[PDB]
Design a protein around this nucleic acid. Structure first.
Lengths: 36, 50, 136, 451, 360, 227
RNA sequence: GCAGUCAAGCGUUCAUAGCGACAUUGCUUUUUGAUUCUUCGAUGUCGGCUCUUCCUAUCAUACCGAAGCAGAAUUCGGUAAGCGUUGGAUUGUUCACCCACUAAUAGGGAUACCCUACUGAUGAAUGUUACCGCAAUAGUAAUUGAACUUAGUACGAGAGGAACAGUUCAUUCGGAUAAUUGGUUUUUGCGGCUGUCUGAUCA
RNA sequence: GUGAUUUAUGGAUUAACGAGAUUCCCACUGUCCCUAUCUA
RNA sequence: GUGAACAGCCUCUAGUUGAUAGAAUAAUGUAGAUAAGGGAAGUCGGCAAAAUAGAUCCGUAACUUCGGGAUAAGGAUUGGC
RNA sequence: UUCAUCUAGACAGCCGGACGGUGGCCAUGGAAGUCGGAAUCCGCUAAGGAGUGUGUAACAACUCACCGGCCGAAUGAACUA
């Protein structure tokens, strides 16, 4: 048939090392909420 | 559609019917002429041989 | 094509775009038509939808009885004013463009006709063939 | 519309309805928006989406409401049928509620799209979109309850038999365990069950028949119990309203026999209870299952009941049964005539001789065609069929007629020369004309004219 | 909207030979005798035809209807040699040719390209190899009898037998649809330096395929090339280029006549009864006369006048009624196409005009 | 009396034609309507697949009787030849030259008398009486000028469109010399010549023709052996 | 949205220090379709075409499941993107919304000679020159409606009424062709015309 | 200041005229269906 | 000569025969033309192209500052001996 | 992991049993284990509910859930990751 698009696992940089850089900040938020 | 299975096999049974038989007799009909052309040219060659 | 039109239509030349005035060959006293529409249309970009002999339209009456004016009703073409080809070999044409009025089913609005109608529409529409005084 | 309601495909429940509409509006309209696109586009997106959802909702609801008959002032007959059967108040208040819900849909639509031109950001505008959609969802899950009732009535409304009260009809009524279903099935083209239990016919069953080149319909009753004389169940009220409204004749189907759920004395008093509903109906009673009883030996008190039935102006006893055809069609004929009772140029012949019609001997001599005979005329469509189909067969237009000789009937007309094709030439005495010119050339050849 | 073009014939370039080359044949049937699968001749002009119509069910059943045909010169066609072809895991492979001991000046003039300066030495060693015994020939022949699941024969035309003057013969190969490849090559060996009709391949009530090269028209741009409207880059954006002289293939072609040169009154239906060959007044338009066999087929073949075509016998067992209907002609127009022709014969011209100043 | 359907159309006398001594039929589609006619009549008389300039409409482009037959200018030598070969030579055949060709549209005729346009030419008006021996009259019906379309005739009876007033009915029954009825066919189809056809021993009508219509035509044309 | 109920579970252990899954109840502008002509600061520059390809979450065309489906057609859903999605009416403005056809008239995205890409065209070198052929690969196109029959069939009470097969036409697209018809003229081929020049005709 | 005429940021009106601005009717036609050809 | 003419067309007196040439007709351009049938549907937009245009006979409304509008409109006619 | 059953016979599978007042109460025109609301018990019992589904206009008939037989070893439920 017309077998559909395959989405990558390439480098494609946003996600990866910069977003859960912020999610390390989310672990900071976890510490901030654990006080309550 | 041209290439639907229903129209196709419905045409295949009919092709197995009258049409292929017409062609099978036509090919013998034309094989007669195709072979007697050799005879015509060969009797011309006999007119050369004499 | 629609209902009533017994038999199929064979391909003929196409003379009548939309906005094409024609005569009304009926016995109601209506005088002219102005085509707006065709039934049995082709689909293509930038085209003008064409009508021809045998075809069935929707259209107005621009001049006729006032009760019928400012109202839309169907019609059949009866004279083409453009050259066509009947397969029994000849080219031909009538002079003038004319179309008569009839219900959507195919039944003729008026009871009678003035002037010639083409063989094609005559063969096609039996109520034309019954109400028509002429053939070609 | 009158006499049929079929163009209402279904009504789904509220959850099916919202799922269908929301799936349609997720499918059709676009779904992909980033923040970095412009605010005109971001407002237009959610505005188009909510507008399309309202479009789908109202497009469903118009098919709902306009599909339904709006029973008020359609017919007293069918309106009373709906009254006994279909819970009038639930019907009207349910349709009014969903129409109100349509107005609510339009109101929330207009209010939100009045707002949304001031959409500023995603945490505001996406939530506005969800808010509008969930609000109309709140209306939908407010409107769950009547929809099952609406659906189940819609299932039954399409499968109703269709009877216009203004036409000639035949209101045949009989007791429980009377044989009226068997009688109707014999007289008419009708499928009605013949198991002798009381409530076998459950509604107004229709049966057609012909008489004097006229159509006639036979309306069967499910049986009646008027023991309070004011209130009867929804099965019994239907034939009651039929006998009330249908302006046609009524046929009483009497069974003076032991094969009933009740005695014979109940039959006459039931007749007396229903007496006021025979105003202009031209009643005709008939006794059935009569071969077993032969009521000529019937007792004096029951015969006195038979006479005590007969004070009303229109009434007529007959006797028939459900194994013979002649008496049943006789009573059918004269019942139709009772209903009828309730309901060109000259030549002058301008001439001395008569113009008699021409009918030759052979048309009378030939046999009328037999549909099935082992040997008969062949109806040449059927001759075509056994060699090729009816479209594919070429037929010789020759060899089907008379000529001087059938040998050269298949001969090819030349019909053509170098010029001046022959059918303008063709007649007899052409050889005589050829000689008439042969003599002429014999003159002019010798005179030196062709010098 | 649609796309203002097709995509199948997309590299719209000129072909490499005016001989449109057969690519397809119907496979085989090894129960019959051999039947030639193709033939070839030279297109000459068009005519108009009326025809009475045995089409059951159609609107025009049992009526006269005018339609339009073409005509092609179809002289007898002589065989000169054969080749074998064997299946591989690459495709097919030419493994031997064999020729037929005496070759015409025409084909010797084909293989050479500047004729008159040539010594015309084309096959002088091959005819010497055709020894007292033909030993090497039979060696390289029975090889093919063993191998070569499918086999073709070479042909050439007799183009001197046409009004056209090119002096050169158009070779081709032709596949067979018989069995018993030994019988095929034996048949062909008997047919060496022997020629073949076109009523010995084809007949009426037939469908054919017509493969040829079109008329050229030069480097016409978009507006007339693709019928496109008038006021990185993709290959389907309707850019200008060469039109015409492409190869094509036209199918489902209903023959009406299989003509004959020796048959006088080739224009004769049963109806006309006029002794006129189909060569109309004035000669053909840029072609001459038709004093040979011919074919009359409806529609319009790709080509121009005085162009070659190749014929194939419809490549499969057709299924439509139109592939099997029975043809009956009623009249051939035989008028000059060098003007609005009115008259079939110059005797008719004399008859309708009368005698004239130059007549006496 | 029989209802009969042409291919899906209820109007018969536009596609076919009847006389007492023969019958005509178009060739549109498949050979079922000819079998339909011969199922009733058989080989008592010739039934002929016929055309008019390749047209299907013989029922309104033709007029004749058991004594003779007429066809307009547009018809061809082939059809004329085939008509004589098919039909016996007892009945006449003749091709007419006129301005206008709608013969069956403008001739309602039976074997003794026929009606025609007012503006019809006197040459063919003489010729039709010459070939058929019938009395000719040039009239209208309720102002409706097409006579061969809105009337169907026989020697038993006849019929006219329903709008005719009774004075018109009687003064035309005088001219036509059979009992008349201002009647209908196929639920009020005004076009009765095509909606039905009739001769002295048969009538044919569309499937939509109802039982009252069947009864009145059956009575007025006196077709069974008990009428 | 807000506020409860129901409360799988969670909590140094936990109902009750407290959250919380899914449903439910609260009106949110009117219980008998009576309507209400509510467009209430649309503040941005695109808008409208020539015209190519791609995505599907399909509007018809395929094949299917279930639905009170007796049929016709419809209501949903599934695989489906192979092929198709119009002519007009109205504003600088996209905002707004009708008429009619058709099977439907789904939603979306993407100066210029210079080198590149695209459309097309030759070309020495393979010991030569020529003919015939193979076909790795690449592209790929056909579509839809209507109709005779089946058949007024079964089914339905009737109104109504398809179907499968056999058969013919037609639409939109593509590719050829010049028989014929119609259009085209520097054949300036044949006539004719106004003014003028070679005295006049002629030319 | 203002700009002919009737009756002074000037008020109601106005025949003729304007390379002044807008709507519509006739015929006209390749603007278009739908493009084709010829000439320097 | 023409004709209203000093418009345009042709010619005598007189003067140039200068404007880089040659061979070829593939598109598209630039200028110039013709096209059936319909007749502004197209388009923001009758943009441009095209229509009557010259001379005589009759005739030419409302409105007006009565002076005009007015070649109004609109119909017929136009050669040669 | 924790609950459970088990050669004093685990589960699968085959067969039978699966009773009364009872057709329990009004409801109804008809509603008897099931259109339906309230209730919902006791005798014998190995077990059998005022009775899960099949379905008659009603009844009727059939099955498991509840038990016993014939075969003999393990097996089921919930939860976790």
């Amino acid at each position: 048939m017309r077998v559909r698009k395959r989405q990558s696992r390439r480098t494609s940089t946003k996600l990866k090392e910069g977003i859960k850089k912020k999610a390390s900040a989310h672990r900071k938020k976890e510490k901030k909420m654990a006080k309550k | 559609s041209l290439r639907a299975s229903s129209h196709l096999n419905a045409k295949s049974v009919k092709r197995r019917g009258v049409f292929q038989k017409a062609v099978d007799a036509r090919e013998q009909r034309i094989s007669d002429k195709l072979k007697e052309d050799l005879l015509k040219q060969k009797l011309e060659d006999l007119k050369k041989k004499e | 094509s629609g209902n009533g039109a017994q038999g199929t239509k064979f391909r003929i030349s196409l003379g009548l775009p939309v906005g094409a005035i024609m005569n009304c060959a009926d016995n109601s006293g209506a005088r002219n038509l102005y085509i707006i529409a065709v039934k049995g249309s082709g689909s293509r970009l930038n085209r003008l939808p064409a009508a021809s002999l045998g075809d069935m339209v929707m259209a107005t009456v621009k001049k006729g009885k006032p009760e019928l004016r400012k109202k839309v009703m169907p019609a059949i073409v009866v004279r083409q004013a453009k050259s066509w080809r009947r397969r029994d070999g000849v080219f031909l044409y009538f002079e003038d463009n004319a179309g008569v009025i009839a219900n959507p089913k195919g039944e003729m609005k008026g009871s009678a006709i003035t002037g010639p109608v083409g063989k094609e529409c005559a063969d096609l529409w039996p109520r034309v063939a019954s109400n028509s005084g002429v053939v070609v | 519309m009158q006499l049929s309601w079929k163009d209402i495909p279904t009504v789904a429940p509220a959850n099916d309805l919202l799922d269908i509409v929301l799936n349609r509006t997720q499918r059709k309209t676009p779904t992909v928006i980033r923040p970095g696109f412009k605010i005109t586009r971001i407002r237009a997106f959610y505005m188009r989406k909510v507008k399309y959802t309202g479009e789908g909702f109202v497009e469903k609801f118009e098919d709902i409401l306009k599909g339904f008959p709006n029973i008020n002032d359609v017919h007293p007959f069918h309106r009373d049928l709906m009254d006994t059967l279909y819970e009038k108040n639930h019907y009207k208040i349910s349709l009014a509620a969903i129409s109100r819900a349509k107005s609510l849909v339009e109101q929330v639509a207009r209010d939100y799209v009045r707002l949304l031109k001031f959409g500023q950001s995603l945490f505001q505008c996406k939530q506005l979109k969800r808010a509008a959609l969930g609000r109309m969802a709140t209306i939908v899950k407010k409107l769950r309850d009547p929809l099952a009732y609406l659906e189940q009535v819609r299932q039954h409304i399409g499968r109703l038999p269709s009877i216009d009260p203004n036409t000639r009809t035949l209101l045949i009524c009989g007791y429980p365990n009377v044989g009226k279903s068997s009688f109707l099935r014999c007289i008419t083209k009708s499928d009605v069950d013949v198991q002798p239990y009381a409530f076998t016919t459950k509604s107004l069953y229709v049966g057609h028949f012909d008489y004097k080149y006229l159509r006639f319909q036979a309306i069967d009753t499910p049986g009646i119990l008027d023991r309070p004389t004011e209130e009867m169940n929804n099965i019994e009220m239907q034939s009651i309203y039929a006998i009330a409204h249908l302006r046609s004749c009524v046929l009483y189907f009497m069974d003076l026999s032991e094969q009933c759920g009740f005695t014979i004395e109940a039959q006459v008093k039931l007749f007396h209870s229903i007496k006021p509903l025979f105003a202009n109906k031209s009643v005709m009673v008939v006794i059935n299952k009569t071969d077993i009883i032969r009521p000529e030996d019937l007792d004096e008190e029951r015969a006195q009941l038979l006479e005590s039935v007969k004070e009303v102006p229109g009434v007529e006893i007959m006797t028939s049964s459900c194994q013979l055809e002649e008496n049943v069609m006789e009573v059918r004929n004269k019942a139709c005539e009772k209903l009828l009772a309730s309901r060109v140029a000259q030549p002058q012949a301008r001439d001395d001789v008569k113009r008699t019609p021409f009918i030759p001997e052979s048309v009378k001599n030939l046999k009328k065609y037999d549909p099935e005979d082992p040997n008969r005329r062949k109806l040449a469509r059927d001759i075509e069929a056994e060699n090729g189909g009816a479209g594919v067969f070429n037929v010789n237009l020759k060899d089907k007629y008379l000529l001087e000789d059938d040998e050269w009937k298949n001969d090819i007309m030349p019909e053509i020369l170098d010029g001046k094709n022959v059918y303008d030439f063709l007649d007899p005495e052409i050889a005589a004309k050829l000689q008439a010119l042969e003599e002429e050339e014999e003159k002019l050849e010798n005179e030196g004219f062709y010098n | 909207a649609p796309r203002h073009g097709h995509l199948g014939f997309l590299p719209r370039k000129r072909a490499a030979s005016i001989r449109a080359r057969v690519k397809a044949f119907p496979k085989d049937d090894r129960s019959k005798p051999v039947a030639l699968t193709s033939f070839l001749g030279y297109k000459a002009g068009m005519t108009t035809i009326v025809r009475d119509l045995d089409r059951p069910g159609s609107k025009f059943h049992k009526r006269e209807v005018v339609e339009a045909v073409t005509v092609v010169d179809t002289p007898p066609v002589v065989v000169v040699g054969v080749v074998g072809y064997v299946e591989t895991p690459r495709g097919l492979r030419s493994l031997t040719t064999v020729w037929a001991e005496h070759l015409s000046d025409e084909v010797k003039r084909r293989f050479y390209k500047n004729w008159y300066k040539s010594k015309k030495k084309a096959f002088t060693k091959y005819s010497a190899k055709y020894a007292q015994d033909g030993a090497g020939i039979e060696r390289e022949l029975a090889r093919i009898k063993k191998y070569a699941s499918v086999v073709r024969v070479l042909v050439h035309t007799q183009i001197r037998k046409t009004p056209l003057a090119q002096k050169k013969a158009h070779l081709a190969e032709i596949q067979l649809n018989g069995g018993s490849i030994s019988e095929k090559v034996d048949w062909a060996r008997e047919h060496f330096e022997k020629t073949v009709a076109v009523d010995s391949v084809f007949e009426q009530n037939e469908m054919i395929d017509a493969i040829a090269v079109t008329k050229g028209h030069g480097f016409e741009g978009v507006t007339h090339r693709w019928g496109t409207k008038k006021l990185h880059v993709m290959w389907s954006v309707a850019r200008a280029g060469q039109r015409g002289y492409h190869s094509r293939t036209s199918i489902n072609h209903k023959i009406y006549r299989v003509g004959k040169g020796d048959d006088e009154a080739n224009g004769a239906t049963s109806f006309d009864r006029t002794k006129k060959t189909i060569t109309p007044m004035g000669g053909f338009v840029h072609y001459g006369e038709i004093k040979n066999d011919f074919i009359m087929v409806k529609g319009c073949i790709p080509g121009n006048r005085k162009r070659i075509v190749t014929l194939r016998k419809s490549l499969y067992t057709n299924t439509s009624r139109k592939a099997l209907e029975e043809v009956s002609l009623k009249w051939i127009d035989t008028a000059s196409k060098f003007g609005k022709g009115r008259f079939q014969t110059p005797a008719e011209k004399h008859a309708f005009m009368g005698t004239l100043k130059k007549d006496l | 009396a029989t209802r009969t359907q042409f291919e899906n159309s209820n109007e018969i006398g536009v596609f076919s034609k009847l006389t007492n001594t023969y019958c005509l039929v178009a060739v549109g589609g498949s050979e079922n309507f000819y079998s339909a006619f011969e199922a009733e009549l058989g080989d008592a008389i010739p039934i002929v697949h016929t055309t008019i300039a390749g047209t299907r409409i013989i029922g309104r482009m033709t007029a004749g009787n058991r004594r003779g037959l007429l066809v307009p200018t547009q018809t061809t030598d082939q059809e004329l030849q085939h008509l004589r070969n098919s039909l016996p030579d007892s009945v006449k055949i003749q091709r007419v030259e006129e301005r206008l060709s709608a013969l069956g549209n403008v001739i309602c005729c039976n074997d003794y008398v026929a009606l025609v346009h007012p503006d019809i030419d006197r040459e063919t008006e003489e010729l039709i009486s010459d070939v058929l021996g019938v009395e000719v009259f040039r009239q209208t019906i309720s102002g409706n000028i097409l006579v061969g379309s809105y009337c169907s005739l026989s020697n038993q009876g006849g019929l006219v469109h329903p709008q005719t007033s009774v004075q018109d009915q009687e003064e035309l029954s005088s001219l036509l010399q059979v009992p008349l009825v201002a009647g209908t066919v196929n639920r009020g189809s005004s076009v009765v010549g095509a909606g039905m056809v009739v001769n002295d021993y048969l009538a044919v009508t569309g499937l939509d023709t109802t039982a009252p219509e069947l009864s009145v035509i059956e009575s007025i044309f006196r077709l069974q052996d008990a009428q």
